[PDB]
Amino acid sequence: MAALAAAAKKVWSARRLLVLLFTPLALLPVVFALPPKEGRCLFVILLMAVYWCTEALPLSVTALLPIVLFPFMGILPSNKVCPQYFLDTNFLFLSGLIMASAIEEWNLHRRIALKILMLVGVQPARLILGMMVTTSFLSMWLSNTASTAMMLPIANAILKSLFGDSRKEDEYRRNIWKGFLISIPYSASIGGTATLTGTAPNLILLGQLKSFFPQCDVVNFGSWFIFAFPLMLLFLLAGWLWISFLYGGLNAEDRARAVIREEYQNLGPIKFAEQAVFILFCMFAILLFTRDPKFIPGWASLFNPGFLSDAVTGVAIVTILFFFPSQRPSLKWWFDFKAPNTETEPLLTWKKAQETVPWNIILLLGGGFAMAKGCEESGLSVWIGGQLHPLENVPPALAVLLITVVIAFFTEFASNTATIIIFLPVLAELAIRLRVHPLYLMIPGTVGCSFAFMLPVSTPPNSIAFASGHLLVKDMVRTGLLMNLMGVLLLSLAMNTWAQTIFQLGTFPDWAD
Amino acid sequence: MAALAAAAKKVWSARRLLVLLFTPLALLPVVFALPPKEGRCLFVILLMAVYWCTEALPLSVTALLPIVLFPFMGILPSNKVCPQYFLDTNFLFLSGLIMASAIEEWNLHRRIALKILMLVGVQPARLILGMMVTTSFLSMWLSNTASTAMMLPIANAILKSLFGDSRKEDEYRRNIWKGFLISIPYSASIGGTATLTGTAPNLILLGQLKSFFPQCDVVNFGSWFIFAFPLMLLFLLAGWLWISFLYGGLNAEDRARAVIREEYQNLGPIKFAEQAVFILFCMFAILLFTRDPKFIPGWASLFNPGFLSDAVTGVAIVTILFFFPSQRPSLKWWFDFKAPNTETEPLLTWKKAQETVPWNIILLLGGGFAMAKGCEESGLSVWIGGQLHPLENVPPALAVLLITVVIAFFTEFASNTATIIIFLPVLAELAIRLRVHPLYLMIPGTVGCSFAFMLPVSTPPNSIAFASGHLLVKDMVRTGLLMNLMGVLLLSLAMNTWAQTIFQLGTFPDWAD
Ligand SMILES: CC(C)CCC[C@@H](C)[C@H]1CC[C@H]2[C@@H]3CC=C4C[C@@H](O)CC[C@]4(C)[C@H]3CC[C@]12C
Ligand SMILES: CC(C)CCC[C@@H](C)[C@H]1CC[C@H]2[C@@H]3CC=C4C[C@@H](O)CC[C@]4(C)[C@H]3CC[C@]12C
Ligand SMILES: CC(C)CCC[C@@H](C)[C@H]1CC[C@H]2[C@@H]3CC=C4C[C@@H](O)CC[C@]4(C)[C@H]3CC[C@]12C
Ligand SMILES: CC(C)CCC[C@@H](C)[C@H]1CC[C@H]2[C@@H]3CC=C4C[C@@H](O)CC[C@]4(C)[C@H]3CC[C@]12C
Ligand SMILES: CC(C)CCC[C@@H](C)[C@H]1CC[C@H]2[C@@H]3CC=C4C[C@@H](O)CC[C@]4(C)[C@H]3CC[C@]12C
Ligand SMILES: CC(C)CCC[C@@H](C)[C@H]1CC[C@H]2[C@@H]3CC=C4C[C@@H](O)CC[C@]4(C)[C@H]3CC[C@]12C
Ligand SMILES: CC(C)CCC[C@@H](C)[C@H]1CC[C@H]2[C@@H]3CC=C4C[C@@H](O)CC[C@]4(C)[C@H]3CC[C@]12C
Ligand SMILES: CC(C)CCC[C@@H](C)[C@H]1CC[C@H]2[C@@H]3CC=C4C[C@@H](O)CC[C@]4(C)[C@H]3CC[C@]12C
Ligand SMILES: COc1ncc(C)cc1CC[C@@](O)(CC(=O)O)C(=O)O
Ligand SMILES: COc1ncc(C)cc1CC[C@@](O)(CC(=O)O)C(=O)O
Ligand SMILES: CCCCCCCCCCCCCC
Ligand SMILES: CCCCCCCCCCCCCC
Ligand SMILES: CCCCCCCCCCCCCC
Ligand SMILES: CCCCCCCCCCCCCC
Ligand SMILES: CCCCCCCCCCCCCC
Ligand SMILES: CCCCCCCCCCCCCC
Ligand code: NA
Ligand code: NA
Ligand code: NA
Ligand code: NA
């Protein structure tokens, strides 16, 4: 009886090599079943999907697979596959990462977090709401992983201060702990969807759009923000109500206020570098939003059409971080010849940025873009559209609901970026077959692939929360059920009510025909 | 009298900000002097050159300037500038960097170095030759900086063992120390030119060729190796003779042998991971060399023409490093159910590669490629060719000699990569004006921009050597004079004797007309 368990453990130990060696053999019939070019492209895409989902290779390493496979299989030459890895969307990602690094270097995110935590309050519903609001707003510009990892110790300190009888009080304290520790990663995931740079799948959408529909240009930072921010707020409010009902029961207050205030003063007085970084961040956000919001003439209209983009603005703004002084300039230093002439330290050195930028995510986005280009060039998109014949009669709203449900449940087991990379071409082809706007299907998939709430493996913030030890898998699963359902319903509402006006989804575009 | 010195020191303290703020003002007349598009492109190129030479910004940050300037000035839209930063040449660079990281992680470079040091000998001429040979051969695949930083402590240990009377012996020991410490960075710089991935300027040449002459494809890993390896050997021999004459006088031996042998056994027994990395490196080099050597039909002829490249081969080979086990596989482990089921550690994790890959150099190469594309698209190349009217009567060999001398002396003050990036378009236009093969001028510039021997600021290996404290600036300068002259002469010999056969430089190519 134990022999089966021993064999299962032995197989599980070598699962990565086994998957890596047996996936090409399993996917080999795809090459023969389909026409040669389309079959080879589908083989490459399925191999990448399996490797991404099983972690047989590092995600960035798997993202490098098109570079080898497309030229070897004749799908796409190297001089075409390689430049796809640094499309301008990926520079927008890099600029967002650099500014997140600059914000985290000067500890500005913690200052903002503690200030918001003071203003929200200490009462348990109000404190849960403040935690969620802070994490969601910080996740617009920082990674969900970083936001969760920074907010969790503050929650631990506040909870220790609050609880520093018998069955009833023990149950109440356990539930409060679980609610606090589950509200942070959920809010981080929700807030990552509000901005294009908030999470990688949002930029996967833009990069794959540049290949499937090159003439589509209505999605940018401003339009995505005006679409997703109200949806993010509604989803955050629904999640807060659900968590408070589930866990929060919808001198301790003095101790919590004291500990929050003590940490905030342990930050120290506001520095010139912090103010400069904050002003640069405000300029970053404002210029990204006001470049071309699609319903106010932006400042991009003053330049050559079709030349400027979000990447140019982001790179230009983050370039200032590498030469702006971190100390207060003073003209008195020029006159005072007796002052020391030490060289000024910039706001961000390139060494710190390089050691803090996640180049693996950049390579993953590039692999997604190159895979989309290979799918478009090989004619595999046409084959997928032909194979989606039976689904052409589904109503567009029902189709949105079904694809959102499928993607939101698929992302519970795999990476959000990998999920959206795999699912986006199918969504585009289905939208083409349904005679509806491609964005009407592509945006819900991009938003719903971030609906990872059930398992620690779903998203890294869930893993960080689970590492605390106060959360069980069953608690996270039972919260994530309703979280996914509410997210899907709110996404359908958003796509059918105000995304239509923002992205002009009412009419089938000419470039989609 | 001291007021002038104080003012000079004050200006020097803020030199970076001063240069950054006053360079656009100084270069402003260029925009008005030239036609608008060409003038703006020249302004951008000159600004980047000044920023690179003065270190007003980090080199990678300066390399991001085209992203902002070309779309804002109408030279090139963002969707065209950005993909230039990940041309396939840059993937070949990345694969070379990953394999250098894998080699250094498993300490294989030190093992090879100590083995070569045993075989060469201990006598001072032989020991200098062994040091130079080891550093030059390791610099084909590792960075010159890494090769110098790894070889310098071994030289220090050997020299301490050797010298562990009065004026004569003290002078002899000082000269021997200086010769040893100056032979390492010179050999690293010389050996970096033998392979395309050995140094960044070699790949700058390929990337800028892809923009100036898209139909040129005769330069690759194999052809560059068969051209530069004999030239590297001749230059290394000349440098060894020169250093031995200048410094080397062209029980201590027992102590040096003992210390070398002791370090080699301190490496430990040969590991399975080291053998796997070495075999993968041999496959890397062989497959890069044999893909298309231009005088044997390579294995690329078995596939679709115009699809495979050096990048595909490099990425495919370095992908194996991320899943190949670092421990010995054994089928006995499958049968032995009582053995532990710990997960195997691959040869290289992505974390180690990411923290060891110099992404700044990747961004610098990309900035060079994008600047070349902007120069080609804006028509600035045609304007430069028109301005090179007076030099059309210079004999081609004399032109090669002059450009090599100019570049080899310019690189003594600035970065090699920046020097070649700035000088390559001028070389291409001059070759077009002289009715000679573009490579006949472009290759000597690429080789000579690595001829940085006079100053610690010239190349980072020189800085590492100067940090030892046994080398004076005058010694390095007086060695670098003759080093530069011999390098220029040998480069002219190579370009006029056997580069003609390798690259078919005898006839003016059709794609250059
Ligand atoms: C790798 C895992 C997770 C997914 C499953 C992969 C393998 C088993 C799947 C993927 C696509 C499949 C093929 C899809 C279509 C056909 C055509 C028809 O003749 C039926 C069998 C055949 C040939 C299938 C055989 C099994 C197949 C090759
Ligand atoms: C630079 C930011 C951070 C602070 C300064 C104020 C902001 C709001 C200013 C600075 C430049 C301004 C833009 C300048 C030019 C135009 C073009 C015009 O046809 C419509 C308004 C528009 C698009 C302006 C909108 C407001 C704007 C973006
Ligand atoms: C715009 C032109 C005309 C003038 C530019 C002046 C710049 C270069 C000057 C003005 C004020 C200066 C700063 C004043 C004080 C200090 C502190 C000291 O540790 C040196 C660096 C630092 C931080 C100086 C850096 C250079 C500085 C920013
Ligand atoms: C989250 C809560 C508040 C609401 C979620 C319910 C979703 C499924 C509801 C809310 C609004 C609804 C839409 C409102 C109006 C229309 C237009 C009609 O011609 C077709 C159905 C369609 C497109 C509805 C589809 C279903 C829909 C999106
Ligand atoms: C930045 C430093 C290191 C390099 C020198 C930059 C400035 C001073 C140089 C670069 C190119 C130069 C211009 C090149 C050509 C002309 C045309 C003619 O009317 C003579 C002056 C004028 C207009 C020059 C003025 C000075 C100039 C603008
Ligand atoms: C793989 C390497 C490291 C070790 C194995 C031996 C090497 C030398 C072998 C493996 C594959 C071989 C190539 C396979 C096919 C061809 C095409 C033929 O028209 C000319 C020879 C050529 C180009 C071979 C050259 C030698 C070669 C490169
Ligand atoms: C090719 C197919 C048929 C079989 C593949 C078998 C592979 C997955 C097996 C064969 C031998 C195995 C290795 C044997 C011994 C050890 C040591 C132990 O700490 C587990 C990992 C490790 C390093 C194993 C990893 C998995 C392994 C490499
Ligand atoms: C380094 C030492 C050994 C030699 C260096 C001297 C250089 C300058 C010499 C050596 C070989 C020479 C070349 C040999 C042959 C020719 C062909 C002739 O039609 C024009 C001159 C030309 C192209 C010579 C130019 C100068 C040259 C390159
Ligand atoms: C450890 O960090 C990551 N590792 C791998 C990947 C693919 C992505 C991340 C960052 C997480 C996320 O992208 C959200 C998500 O994709 O799940 C974010 O915005 O923080
Ligand atoms: C500290 O390392 C570097 N920093 C900056 C730059 C631009 C390049 C390097 C690497 C050095 C070199 O590229 C030789 C050279 O370009 O001088 C090599 O091959 O080691
Ligand atoms: C000509 C045959 C085409 C179908 C088989 C292709 C197999 C490619 C395997 C690539 C594996 C990459 C990860 C190890
Ligand atoms: C019909 C032309 C292409 C034939 C070969 C297709 C499969 C190539 C597989 C290469 C795998 C390389 C792994 C490193
Ligand atoms: C009283 C307000 C003091 C503000 C000090 C910090 C100012 C930072 C300015 C940064 C500007 C960046 C764009 C040029
Ligand atoms: C329309 C005017 C064109 C000429 C002037 C352009 C100035 C651009 C300055 C860019 C500076 C970038 C580094 C701070
Ligand atoms: C003729 C059309 C372009 C006019 C403006 C050219 C100069 C633009 C300079 C932008 C500098 C941005 C620095 C961040
Ligand atoms: C006696 C020789 C033992 C050799 C052990 C190491 C073998 C490494 C093989 C690596 C192969 C990589 C390509 C599949
Ligand atoms: Na985020
Ligand atoms: Na997920
Ligand atoms: Na090197
Ligand atoms: Na140099």
- CA-to-CA distance for A94 and A357, rounded, in angstroms? 8
Helices (H), A193-271: 200-212, 221-243, 252-267
Residue type (1 letter), A283: M
CA distance A468 to A452: 18
Task: Specify the amino acid at residue A253.
Answer: E
Q: Is residue A24 part of a domain?
A: no
User: What single-letter DSSP state applies at residue A194?
Assistant: S
In a domain, A248, yes or no: yes
User: What distance in angstroms lies between residue B176's CA and the mean position of ligand 2's atoms?
Assistant: 67
Amino acid letter at B175? N
Q: Which DSSP letter does residue A345 get?
A: P
Interface test mutation site (partner A, options B211, B307, B332, max chain A beta carbons within 10 A): B307
Ligand nearest to the CA of A29: 1
Q: B2-15 burial, b if ≥16 CB within 10 A, otherwise e?
A: eeeeeeeebeebbe
Best to test chain A binding among B61, B335, B360 (most A CBs inside 10 Å): B61
Q: Report whether A98 contacts A320 (CB < 8 A).
A: no
Domain count, chain B: 1
For residue A32, report the distance from its CA to the centre of ligand 11, in Å.
13
Quoted resolution (Å): 2.2
Which residue, A370, A375, A380, is CA-closest to B312?
A370
Distance (angstroms) between ligand 13 centre and the Cα of A279 equals 7
| DSSP per-residue string spanning B312-374 | HHHHHHHHGGGTSBSS---THHHH-TTS--PPPPBSS-HHHHHHHS-HHHHHHHHHHHHHHHH
Residues less than 5 Å from ion ligand 19, measured at CB: B 139, 143-144, 192, 198
Centroid of chain to Cα A377: 27
Distances from the Cα of B200 to the Cαs of B11, B76, B310, B351, in angstroms? 33, 25, 15, 23
Ligand 12 atom closest to residue B316's alpha carbon, by position in its atom list: 14
Let me know if residue A52 belongs to a domain.
yes
Would A29 be classed as within a structural domain? no
Helix A200-212 and helix A359-377, axial crossing angle in degrees, nearest 10: 30
Which chain B residues touch A41 with a CB distance below 8 Å?
Answer: none
Q: Judge whether A78 lies within some domain.
A: yes
Task: Give the chain A residue nearest B81 (alpha carbons).
Answer: A88
Q: Verify whether ligand 13 is closer than 6 Å to residue A279 (CB atom).
A: yes
Kindly state whether residue A116 falls inside one of the protein's structural domains.
Answer: yes
Q: Two tokens at B219?
A: 């330069």
Nearest to A350 among B60, B341, B343 (CB): B60
**Residue A74 distance to chain B (closest CA, Å):** 6
Torsion of CA A479, A482, A486, A491, to 10 degrees: 80
B7–A68 C-beta distance less than 8 A: no
Question: Is the distance from CB of A421 to CB of A382 less than 8 angstroms?
Answer: no
Give every CB contact of residue A73 below 8 A, 6+ residues apart in sequence: A40, A41, A43, A44
**Contacts A64 to B, Cβ<8 Å:** 315, 319
For residue B331, give every residue at least 6 positions away whose Cβ sits within 8 Å of its Cβ, in sequence order, or none: none
CA dihedral B373, B376, B379, B382 (to 10 degrees): 160
CB of A78 closer than 8 Å to CB of B311: yes
Set of chain A residues whose Cβ sits within 8 Å of the Cβ of B60: 350, 354
Ligand 7: list residues with CB < 6 Å: A 13-14, 17-18, 21; B 325, 327, 329-330, 333, 342, 344
Residue A425: inside a domain, yes or no? yes
Residue B172, φ and ψ in degrees, nearest 5:
-60, -45
Cβ atoms of B456 and B476 closer than 8 Å: yes
> Is B8 contained in some domain?
no
Q: How far apart are CA A95 and CA A196, in angstroms?
A: 12
Angstroms from A282 CA to nearest CA on chain B = 19
Q: State which amino acid sits at residue A17.
A: L
CB contact at 8 A, B128 and B117: no
Q: Are A181 and A470 in contact (CB under 8 A)?
A: yes
Contact call for residues A449 and A419 (beta carbons, < 8 A):
yes
Residue type, position A179, single letter: G
* Residue whose tokens read 């012996």: B169
- Rounded distance, CA B440 to CA B427, Å? 9
- B325/A17 Cβ within 8 A: yes
Span from the CA of B1 to the centroid of ligand 3 (angstroms): 24
CB atoms within 10 A of CB B298: 17
How much is the CA Rg of chain B, to the nearest whole Å?
A: 24
End-to-end alpha carbon distance in chain A: 61
The CA B502 to ligand 12 mean position distance, Å, reads 29
Q: CB of B416 closer than 6 A to ligand 10?
A: yes
| Distance, CA of A167 to CA of B81 (rounded, Å) | 65
Q: Distance between CA atoms of A181 and A247, rounded to whole angstroms?
A: 11
* Domain span including residue B420: 22-512
Phi first, then psi, for residue A366 (nearest 5°) are -65, -40
Confirm if A274 and A308 have CB atoms less than 8 A apart: no
- DSSP-derived 3-state class of residue A470: coil
Cα distance between residue A10 and residue B335, in whole Å:
10
CB B224 within 8 A of CB B205: no
Angle at A341 between CA A335 and CA A347, to 5 degrees: 105
Work out the end-to-end distance of chain B between its first and last CA atoms, rounded to an integer number of angstroms.
61
